[PDB]
Amino acid sequence: VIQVFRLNFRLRTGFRVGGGQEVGDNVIRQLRIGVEGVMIPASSWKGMFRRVSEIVLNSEDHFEEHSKKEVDTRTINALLKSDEKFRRIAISKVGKEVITQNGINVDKLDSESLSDLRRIYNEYN
RNA sequence: AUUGAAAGUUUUUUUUUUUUUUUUUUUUUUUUUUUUUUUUUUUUUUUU
């Protein structure tokens, strides 16, 4: 399912999204385009929306970069064997040889691969 | 029917924070509301 939105905002007074602002300090220059004039970059929109969503959710897990607890490898294996898309993501990232169809291949695993898998689990959750 | 092929240069990151166009600056200094004009003229304290 795809949800499409066309949001409009009745901002009080004005806004300003600068960039570069040349050198020599003095005035503050809002970012230009050259042809279209001025715009708000999509990255700024995404950052503002992420901030608002983080405020809304108020998740303690998200506050500490999802690095506050140790995730058991058994749980990781259970999710991997239970979620096909998660398994596909893990295989596409850490490598097909490292992660087989069924199992984690602990012998080939090392510190950084394990950390990557734990971070992927935390962020996917 | 190319020696021969099939892969998105992709994900991810808010150009943001610090700063009161502020202090000082009395719409006042001068100019007599005076100036020419008689409250005046007419009338018997009185008759059969």
A90: exposed, middle or buried (C-beta count within 10 Å: 0-12, 13-18, 19+)?
A: buried
Distance A105 CA to B44 C1' (A): 164
The tokens describing A44, both together, are 């700024």
Helix (H) or strand (E) holding A121: helix A111-124
Cβ proximity of A69 and A93 under 8 Å: no
Render the burial of A10-33: b for 16+ CB within 10 Å, e for the rest: eeeeeeeeeeeeeeeeeeeeeeee
Nearest to A66 by CA among A4, A125, A26, A7: A125
Cβ proximity of A117 and A70 under 8 Å: no
Minimum CA–C1' distance nucleotide for A54: B14
Q: How large is the greatest C-alpha to C-alpha distance in chain A, in angstroms?
A: 63
Distance A59 CA to B30 C1' (A): 81
Bases along strand B below 7 A from a protein CB: 12-16
Cβ proximity of A77 and A96 under 8 Å: no
Q: What is the resolution of this structure in A?
A: 3.5
